[model samples]
Target: GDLYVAGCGVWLPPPVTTEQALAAGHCDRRLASSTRMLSVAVADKETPAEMAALAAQTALDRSGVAPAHVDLVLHASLYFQGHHLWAPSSYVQRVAVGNRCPAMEVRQVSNGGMAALELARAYLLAAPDRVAALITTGDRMHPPGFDRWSSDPGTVYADGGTALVLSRQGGFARLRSLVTVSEPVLEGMHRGGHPFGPPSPEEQAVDLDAHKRAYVAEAGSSFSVARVSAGQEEALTGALEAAGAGLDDISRVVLPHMGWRRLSAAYFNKWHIQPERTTWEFGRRTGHLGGGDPIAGFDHLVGSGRLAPGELCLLVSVGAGFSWSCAVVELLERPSWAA
Candidate 1:
């Protein structure tokens, strides 16, 4: 594919340390030790759409691709966007892009950003006139509606926004390959045993752990683990094969900003790679940025001068829909901002 990553940016709020969370009783001692998360970005008043717009503006400015060439805008998220019956993508486009192109929202849980990239790649390759696409992900997981720490016991969710500008023309990095794998049978992993009937928003506290327990109880723990592991491997090997490369060919890994235990089971031990080879340290501080983890991880790697020119970085993401997406990006040149 000729898709290139023109610019990458993220907007994260000030962090609250694990010690601070523990002191506030927002996180327990066992969890703080289990996840080994140093801190998480917590939002005070920033909304998802506004954060997305800000990230989009940063990416657009860094790209210098011109809003006129922005043929499409795709906004992704994993949680509520402040209001109902409104288009967040349109808000992003209006505030950042000001383009008349198709502004749409993409949701695939945590894999939304990669899913959007897959679609935007196809859209650009489908036509010669298409110049570029803007992809963004933003979320603010809070209390009363959702618990950032307890909603997902093993993982800590963060409030932030991430953005990437994809261009068909030229960019600092080239998309070597992208692969997505799905296991629809595990769709119930996040749905829980609750009824499907639509009703009042009463007591929907986003208990992911309860959902997992219910799903595993019915589907069997063994079945769930194997399916998830198999899906992730499929995406990994598929992307590597498509790029004509191997796991060792990747210089760095942009992994999901998951907890230490989750990373160990999902990637570290599974891939036989050390934490030093991935964005583990960065992730432990940032926490999970919903669907934007991969984007933010890659941006941090580049911005920190960790990914040199000509090196390949593997991007990994898995959504609650049991969808796994893997992509390989080769750095062609260090962007001026990064330099």
Candidate 2:
């Protein structure tokens, strides 16, 4: 009874570097708004709505599923500070999906997509009549005057999002299990203040520290634990236990792009769960894509022959908000598929 992610879509222009943004004179003017700098935008010139459309359609097409069959649509993103923010996802759902079914939004900061999947699973489990769900997510906002000075791998944030099609009958992969774990260890994951919010600069900075302290402090918040722990063993173990399996049973592990060093060794050992990691090519190429990391990473694995036919892929994500989520699926690639 696994729910397969049958289709996926993503939209990213050529890699843009800080130097390029500077040369191109990409200016946000918001750079001086804050003292501490964050990753700048790559300035692909693609609107968030267009990126959503491109990603959503790609996944639907890849899965060969018609939008008319979708029972629900969930559009999750963190950068929706639009002029109008109330139920913004509804507009995107109506315009991009063109599906009349129930549509809503889920916001868990960087962990939005995986969170949506869990929510969708609950919906499907509760109502079998609803056969399919579409989850679209991405972030293309750059604080003004930003560049690659930030540690994030991608210069400024790359511009892109991805859409995933989840279905019951014709799924490309089935969701065997899902587990989400919260830790008190690292609360700093999302403690950084909200931009343009009411908090004073001092309050925001203090929140940032409290958040970081949550991670650095013993038993840090949940996000830091997953970031430090790799496969998020406790969370993954819960899922495996529910599925009556163990770490060794997993054929592929699509982990978060926590950089090459941690994922390269120590973290995996800490979790005691082994998965064919994908952050190698992905995080290196696109940096941490906020909510779109795992979806795009999953697609990258499937499209790149990492998740071969009938292989079990342990889809995992650790995002801001100290969120850790995971699921198990079997790749159902045809011989003529991406290969």
Candidate 3:
């Protein structure tokens, strides 16, 4: 079985709107880029040892578990320059959960937290003796949203952090399933070739073309900046199948708020999902908290008294890796905070 998120935490910057960005000549595309970047600095930041610790503290308090009880710590974020290259994993370990347990940092892009959660599940399954694991992921800053100045649709990104505590028992939610499908679809996300293997230039070109096709097929055209409806359906459907569920079985659907209304429409249109019941009204308030979307959304649900007993909510995460991950959590009744 997969590990569950026993506790969760998120840190968000003040949100910015398209109208504000348009005045700055950011975009006329009605993009979801947050002006939140103006309030935070990233060039010389490492999540601050204190910030990391506080995230862990939040998890501890939420779960009613002592930090010392956590056996593994994983920090999943966009940047962790504090370690540069050396045993870079210690930065979060030292401050958050302390050096009491083994630790590592995951530097995946937008899907960092999803990847971290999947990885944590594997680790827990491999070591049943290990009762708890801590996964913290966030993106403090993305220069001017993920959209570049050149209207690089990919550049309109956001920032925020989410910390999760996974335990063998006593969780408000249970990890039901997780799956990923990575075959080439659209392409041109990033051209070139494999950075590791020595494939010939011809092979490299083929791979690059495949990459571009897959990226576009999955993430949508650079001009539109939307996900390919068919592609998202295929991936999400596979995940739902793995969890023995269908769209109707999901009580709540949490997704990445790359854009507000567009994002919601795109997801439901793609996966045929609807969240009229367990709705999440905090995305705009939190403004796309990096890899923290799911946890952030989860917190919103629990905190708002939306999640009910035995409700099965689906967390769908899609990122530039041109990847998709869906996690199903069966939640208990509302948390005390919600009451």
Candidate 4:
């Protein structure tokens, strides 16, 4: 209820242009033209945890909160983190904060970052002595089993990490409201073709299109679309209502780094928000950074001096688990980094 965004940071590798992808046969002209994505971050050899730790270091340094003040460490991710059996959270805690606080991993697909934020807020509110919590998100959508260009078709994936420091004590921005909503009925959309039971040892290329098609064929398109829309509306309305504000009152919108086509249907047209009011331009060049989209978007807005003091900003995100999260953030003053 009373949380603040003390600091936010991002660590991204160099971006590969769409032209480079097309020329290398990594992407087709049709897909590139439709998505209008300029470039996507591609890592050379950095692991997810490594980048996450790097980002956390920046966030922690900028926060000016002592390591001892951090009561919890939560690291979130969408894809694999190097090995099958490893603790990225513990790794992040050791490299970044180095505190003996409880280190845990949070996963809710693309909504993992916001999920961590919610948990961290509750944790800080749980104890009066707790000062702050560190939430980090990182992913490298690399392949043998994944394709960043055409895995989901509409949205392009990228490799990067983002971090945010949530404090109960004080910060540059106040978290007015943070709300999360879900509809489990649509969970099958991302795994329709795969069976849950009888674990298989086989590793096949992920085909989200096939899963979505099978799911829609069984669940009906209208039913699928309506539930997704409803979940987003619930999160948006809930956050705004809790914050005692309206859509028009928000000065900047930190939207998911989805491509133009998807954003046009889900956000721009649906909410009547123009590209100028959101992070569309920045995201088109950056690609989707999984759950870190909200974090990266907010960082870009604030770091670029686009979100001024006393301005209210809205952050929205969704994951394949069919969970949607929204938060209203009110900037109290200019951060030292931005200034």
Alpha-carbon RMSD of each model = 1.9, 6.2, 5.9, 1.7
Please identify model 1 stretches exceeding 4 Å from their true place.
194-203
Q: Tell me the whole-model lDDT of each prediction, alpha carbons only.
A: 0.91, 0.63, 0.60, 0.91
TM-score, per-candidate, Cα-based:
0.97, 0.77, 0.76, 0.97
Over 247-271, each residue of candidate 1 has an lDDT whose tens digit, in order, gives 9999999999888889998888888
Candidate 2 vs 4: which has more TM-score = 4
Worst 10 residues of 2 by lDDT: 32-41
* Deviation of model 4 at 270, angstroms: 0.8
Give the CA lDDT, 0 to 100, for residue 276 in model 4.
Answer: 98
Q: What are the per-residue Cα lDDT tens digits for candidate 4 across 50-117? A: 99999999999999999999999999998889887889999999999988999999999999999999
For model 2, the superposed segments whose C-alpha errors exceed 4 Å read 17-43, 145-156, 184-189, 192-231, 262-277, 335-337
- Per-residue lDDT of 1-339 in model 2, one digit per residue for the tens? 667677876776566543444455652334312211223324356666567667887777777777777888887776643446566456667666787888887877667888888888777667767677888886665545223323232123455777888887676666778888765334444354322233234321112334455434544356444465653557777877876777677676776554444454534565555433434446555655557777877787777777776667777776654677877777766423466
Query: lDDT, candidate 4, residue 9?
Result: 97
- Put down candidate 3 lDDT per residue, 1-339, tens digits, no spaces: 555667876555455654566677756543434222221212224342334555666776788766666877877765433334654346556666664787887654556778777777777778767778888765544343233222224234455556888887667777777765442332235443442223235321112235555444545575325445545666678777877888788878887654434565666464455536433345544445556677777777777767788888788776554567777778865655565
Clashing pairs in 4: none
Return model 3's CA RMSD, one decimal: 5.9
**Candidate 2 similarity to native, TM-score:** 0.77
Residue 12 C-alpha lDDT in model 1: 96
Model 1: pairs clashing at backbone N, Cα or C within 3 Å: none
